């Protein structure tokens, strides 16, 4: 049935894997193991539609990013993740978005901006700053915590809702 190909991108350590694993497997990964390229598939009902999520969890560490752009080519929508306690990861978002536009050869690609680790109080990216970035892109901004589950389903389901607008 309806399949949605989602790709999760962003700087090393922002919580791409923890977010995906919380969504799919319902637990929090406390440790840090850098990703090369992993995929997950699960059947879910989203707004009354039974569908299949195929999620590519990509490397954020440059050293482990070989051929990432090839893996990403098939993505239908992209979760652009930064951490709210990592200003550099937020600044990097523009470069991830440019890479997405390159691999899709389009300036109109479904995406959602995600500010993760919202359970932490060492915030250096304020909500309004991320809202403004997302506005400039024509996409939603959503905050998440892979640790508490806050916003996790919402982030991924919102991306499906963006793909459906394409
Ligand atoms: N407090 C808190 N810690 C988080 C959250 N998400 C991830 N972390 C922590 O941050 C570290 C990195 O998470 P991870 O998911 O591996 O990040 P990543 O973006 O997949 N890294 P990589 O690009 O190298 O694969 C882990 O120690 C993890 O527990 C969150 O929402 N809250
Ligand atoms: Ca755990
Ligand atoms: Ca291209
Ligand atoms: Mg990872
Ligand atoms: Mg500031």
Curated annotation (Swiss-Prot):
Effect on the protein of changing residue 119 to N: Loss of GTP-binding activity
Positions annotated as glycosylated: 35
Bilayer disposition of the protein: Lipid-anchor
Localization: Cell membrane; Golgi apparatus; Golgi apparatus membrane
Post-translational modification: Palmitoylated by the ZDHHC9-GOLGA7 complex. A continuous cycle of de- and re-palmitoylation regulates rapid exchange between plasma membrane and Golgi.
Listed Pfam families: Ras
Keyword RNA-binding: no
Outcome when changing residue 61 to K: In NMTC2; somatic mutation; increases transformation of cultured cell lines
Effect noted on mutating residue 12 to D: In CSTLO; severe mutation
Catalyzed chemical reaction(s): GTP + H2O = GDP + phosphate + H(+)
Binding site for GTP: 13-18, 29-35, 59-60, 116-119, 145-147
Effect listed in the UniProt record for changing residue 26 to G: Loss of interaction with PLCE1
UniProt entry tagged with the keyword Nucleus: yes
Consequence of changing residue 61 to V: Strongly increased transformation of cultured cell lines
Annotated consequence of substituting residue 37 to G: No effect on interaction with PLCE1
Expression tissues: Widely expressed.
GO biological process: adipose tissue development; animal organ morphogenesis; cell surface receptor signaling pathway; cellular response to gamma radiation; cellular senescence; chemotaxis; defense response to protozoan; endocytosis
SUPFAM superfamilies: P-loop containing nucleoside triphosphate hydrolases
Effect seen on changing residue 38 to N: No effect on interaction with PLCE1
Primary localization class, coarse: membrane
N-acetylmethionine modified-residue sites: 1
Keywords tagged on the record: Acetylation, Cell membrane, Cytoplasm, Disease variant, Glycoprotein, Golgi apparatus, GTP-binding, Hydrolase, Isopeptide bond, Lipoprotein, Membrane, Methylation, Nucleotide-binding, Nucleus, Palmitate, Prenylation, Proto-oncogene, S-nitrosylation, Ubl conjugation
UniProt modified residues of type S-nitrosocysteine: 118
Its job: Involved in the activation of Ras protein signal transduction. Ras proteins bind GDP/GTP and possess intrinsic GTPase activity.
Subunit structure: In its GTP-bound form interacts with PLCE1. Interacts with TBC1D10C. Interacts with RGL3. Interacts with HSPD1. Found in a complex with at least BRAF, HRAS, MAP2K1, MAPK3 and RGS14. Interacts (active GTP-bound form) with RGS14 (via RBD 1 domain). Forms a signaling complex with RASGRP1 and DGKZ. Interacts with RASSF5. Interacts with PDE6D. Interacts with IKZF3. Interacts with RACK1. Interacts with PIK3CG; the interaction is required for membrane recruitment and beta-gamma G protein dimer-dependent activation of the PI3K gamma complex PIK3CG:PIK3R6. Interacts with RAPGEF2.
Stated name of the protein: GTPase HRas
């Amino acid at each position: 049935m309806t399949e949605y190909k989602l790709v999760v991108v962003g700087a090393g350590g922002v919580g791409k894997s923890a977010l995906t694993i919380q969504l799919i497997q319902n637990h929090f990964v406390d440790e840090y193991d850098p990703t090369i390229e992993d995929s997950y598939r699960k059947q879910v009902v989203i707004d009354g539609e039974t569908c299949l999520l195929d999620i590519l969890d990509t490397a954020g560490q440059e050293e482990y990013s070989a051929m990432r752009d090839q893996y990403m080519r098939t993505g239908e929508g992209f979760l652009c993740v930064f951490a709210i306690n990592n200003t550099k990861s937020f600044e990097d978002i523009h470069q991830y978005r440019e890479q997405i536009k390159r691999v899709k050869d389009s300036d109109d690609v479904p995406m959602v901006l995600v500010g993760n680790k919202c359970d932490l109080a060492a915030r250096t990216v304020e909500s309004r700053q991320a809202q403004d970035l997302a506005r400039s892109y024509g996409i939603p901004y959503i905050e998440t915590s892979a640790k508490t589950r806050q916003g996790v389903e919402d982030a991924f389901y919102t991306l499906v809702r963006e793909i459906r607008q394409h």
